[PDB]
């Protein structure tokens, strides 16, 4: 279910009225979702499989599960609803915020260059509506490194100062790092001035109350079996699959930051 | 299969709460209590602009700096006693993101974020109030410049600057004369109000 | 998975924009309309609701159209002339739809037609949906 | 009593006898077709099932028509060209209806048009129904 609205029943009325006005009642809705199917197949030749000195069967049995995990984790993020769970970076429902450019030229012939500065991180992080509860950020480690390696106008470090390296308590800071997300620095080669500047529109970080902004549904774990109908006396076939799904929840509980 | 009576009761109570809170602040006196924001009796403090142009060709732009907040807060007469400030969360977020000339943050410095103890700071945040930043989109330079006269924050001794009077809490009853053998009807209502007390015990800060 | 939802919840065209087709509802115990626009409107458009009785000569062919009566609810306004009607506001966007229904059945046929046929009425489409076959 | 079925099971026109309208199936879990004849047929009438995807010029407008591929079942025969089609026999009476559906979704829009626009094609009507919302 879902409570779209509550309505506006009462009103402030004059004491001379004996009657009252009928208010507009609320609205409720019913919603439903599906579960999707993951399937695959691979083939072997009996003679080679028997005479080879390496266990290709178990190698493939491991590779299949690794690929399943990778693909599920990526599909929940950028999938489309046709046959995959629809992702929150694809649905484009979370509000987007753009980072202003920085002028690097003279006052009369300015040069606008896209940029990402330290105070933008604090501005973005502290703007989460308080009523929605606690939230957590997600980033690619290169973004965190680029942020931690900043210096002020005098050459001294921001954040950890007087120390060779800076390493805050991430759990306390409410930041989670995972290299799955897009990387704006392009492997630490971009982020300066001139030709090395960022590219406009690049993804940086996202924040939300996940426990109510996105859901994941579990139905079946992976299974393997031999396909007797294609197996022959000289070559063999296997089949496997699993089922799972996911859907978005409250679109208002999310926030995405991007380079403007 | 879904109970509607309790839903309607909850909606009624929620609407009552929202309407009362809105009226006490910005309500007009016709059929609702008059709020202090609508009355606009508290004396006002403005904010100077800042010249963003060359000295001989000034470009006057409205602004709001860190020291203005301290100046406003520290100038409350001590005779009136305890006082607290109220302002939108975006104002606090815009204030906490300021930097000095070299680039280092003011307030919480050497750390990723600033989160003071508002209970000790004597600040209570409320999103109902006007937001001068326009959803974190205004507050820069040029096209991003503030709009003059925008509300920023207020401070007062509320326990003598405003009063809330309550007479009867809400009640629900069934209208016997309208509920036939195949229908039903319910009625509800309540009475309440408030009035502005001493208008000298408050202050308002605005852009100039 | 996918289902043959047409087995349990069939739908029939009710107003094409140039011709009105009676819709039989004898074998179904629920029904409702669905309005959609094809291009931006310029003014409001009202619609009338009619029903029919089984023709005398042939019981499988509808009779002449009749105007549906009104039915005030437990408490609320009533129509000026006491006959049910529907009005589509001009602010409806192309990428949306509207759902409405009548509280009573009357005859075994139902129909819907605009008050006046014009360019505005030529931009609207109405379709009827049933539920719960009883035979 | 009566319900507002249009809220949960909206219905949209797909073929009114002269024009085909793309229908947005992206926001619903399931869907199906519904065929009704308005006059006795004289020859077979086959139909074609297409689908569209969001156009790059505007994501809210469908792109060019693509044709659905076939999906054979276990005990069944694959179509000659591997493309879905539907055929309505001449035995269909004016006082009945037929319901059919497709097992796969593909693009977010769907459409149905006849193989050829002949005289008999104007005697048929096709409507689409959706069964569960997801947005």
């Amino acid at each position: 279910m879902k409570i779209a609205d509550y309505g506006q029943l009462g009103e402030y009325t004059c004491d001379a009225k004996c009657d009252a006005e009928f208010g507009e009642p609320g609205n409720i809705r019913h919603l439903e979702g599906k579960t999707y199917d993951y399937r695959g197949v691979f083939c072997f030749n009996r003679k080679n499989l028997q005479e080879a000195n390496y266990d290709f069967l178990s190698f493939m049995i491991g590779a299949a599960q690794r690929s399943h995990r990778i693909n599920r984790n990526r599909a929940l993020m950028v999938g489309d609803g046709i046959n995959e769970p629809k992702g929150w970076l694809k649905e484009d429902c979370f509000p987007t915020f753009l980072t202003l450019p920085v002028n690097t030229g003279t006052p009369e012939n300015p040069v606008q260059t896209p940029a990402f500065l330290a105070q933008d991180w604090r501005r973005f992080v502290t703007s989460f509506p308080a009523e929605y509860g606690d939230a957590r950020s997600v980033m690619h480690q290169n973004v965190f490194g680029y942020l931690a390696a900043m210096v002020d106008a005098n050459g001294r470090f921001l954040f950890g100062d007087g120390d060779l390296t800076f390493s805050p308590d991430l759990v306390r800071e409410r930041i989670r790092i995972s290299n799955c997300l897009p990387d704006p620095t392009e492997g630490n080669t971009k982020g300066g001035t001139g030709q090395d500047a960022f590219a406009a529109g690049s993804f940086i970080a996202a924040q939300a109350a996940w426990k109510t902004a996105y859901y994941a549904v579990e139905k079946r774990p992976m299974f393997f079996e031999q396909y007797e109908g294609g197996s022959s006396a000289w070559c063999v076939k296997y089949q496997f699959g699993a089922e799972d799904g996911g859907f978005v929840g409250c679109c208002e509980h999310g926030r995405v930051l991007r380079i403007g | 299969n879904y109970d509607f009576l309790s839903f309607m009761i909850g909606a009624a109570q929620r609407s009552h709460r929202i309407n009362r809170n809105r009226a006490l602040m910005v309500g007009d006196g016709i059929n609702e209590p008059k709020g202090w924001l609508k009355e606009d009796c508290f004396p006002t403090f403005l904010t100077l602009p800042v010249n963003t142009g060359t000295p001989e060709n000034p470009v006057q732009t409205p602004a709001f700096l860190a020291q203005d907040w301290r100046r406003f807060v520290t100038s409350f007469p001590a005779e009136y006693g305890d006082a607290r400030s109220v302002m939108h969360q975006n104002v606090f977020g815009y204030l906490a993101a300021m930097v000095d000339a070299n680039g280092r943050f003011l307030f919480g410095d050497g750390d990723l974020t600033f989160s003071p103890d508002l209970v000790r700071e004597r600040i209570r945040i409320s999103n109902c109030l006007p937001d001068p930043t326009e959803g974190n989109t205004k507050g820069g330079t040029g096209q991003d410049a503030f709009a003059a006269g925008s509300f920023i924050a207020a401070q007062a001794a509320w326990k003598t600057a405003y009063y809330a009077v309550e007479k009867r809490p809400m009640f629900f009853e069934q209208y016997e004369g309208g509920s036939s053998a195949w229908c039903v009807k319910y009625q509800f209502g309540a009475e309440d109000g408030g009035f502005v007390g001493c208008c000298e015990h408050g202050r308002v800060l605005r852009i100039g | 998975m996918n289902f043959n939802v047409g087995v349990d919840f069939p739908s029939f065209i009710a107003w094409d924009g140039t011709t009105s087709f009676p819709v039989k509802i004898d074998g179904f115990n629920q029904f409702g309309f669905t309005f959609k626009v094809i291009e931006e409107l310029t003014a409001d458009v009202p619609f009338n609701i009619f029903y029919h009785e089984a023709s005398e000569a042939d019981p499988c062919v509808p009779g002449p159209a009749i105007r549906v009566p009104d039915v005030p609810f437990c408490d609320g306004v009533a129509t000026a002339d006491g006959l049910a009607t529907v009005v589509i506001p001009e602010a409806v966007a192309v990428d949306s739809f509207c759902a409405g229904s009548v509280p009573c059945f009357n005859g075994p046929w139902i129909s819907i037609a605009p008050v006046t046929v014009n360019a505005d009425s030529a931009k609207v489409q109405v379709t009827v949906t049933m539920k719960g076959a009883t035979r | 009593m009566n319900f507002n079925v249009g809220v949960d099971f909206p219905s949209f026109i797909a073929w009114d006898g002269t024009t085909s309208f793309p229908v947005k199936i992206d926001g619903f879990n399931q869907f199906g077709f519904t065929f009704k004849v308005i006059e006795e047929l004289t020859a077979d009438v086959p139909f074609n099932i297409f689908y569209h995807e969001a156009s790059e010029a505007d994501p809210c407008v469908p792109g060019p028509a693509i044709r659905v591929p076939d999906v054979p079942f276990c005990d069944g025969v694959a179509t000659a060209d591997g493309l879905a089609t539907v055929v309505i026999p001449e035995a269909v009476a004016v006082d009945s209806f037929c319901a059919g559906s497709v097992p796969c979704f593909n693009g977010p829009w769907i459409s149905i048009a006849p193989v050829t626009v002949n005289a008999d094609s104007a005697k048929v009507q096709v409507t689409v129904t959706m069964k569960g919302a997801t947005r």
């Binding site: 429902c93 987007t96 501005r123 | 507050g139 | 529907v86 409405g100 | -």
Partner: peptide, 27 residues
């Protein structure tokens, strides 16, 4: 007078700029 129930099909994104306090603007 029947009352209609309406709601849209297609959503639309929404992007906004993020403006932070400028450099040490001084009087």
């Amino acid at each position: 007078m029947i009352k209609l129930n309406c709601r849209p099909l297609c959503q639309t994104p929404t992007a906004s700029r993020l403006v932070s306090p400028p450099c040490f603007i001084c009087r």
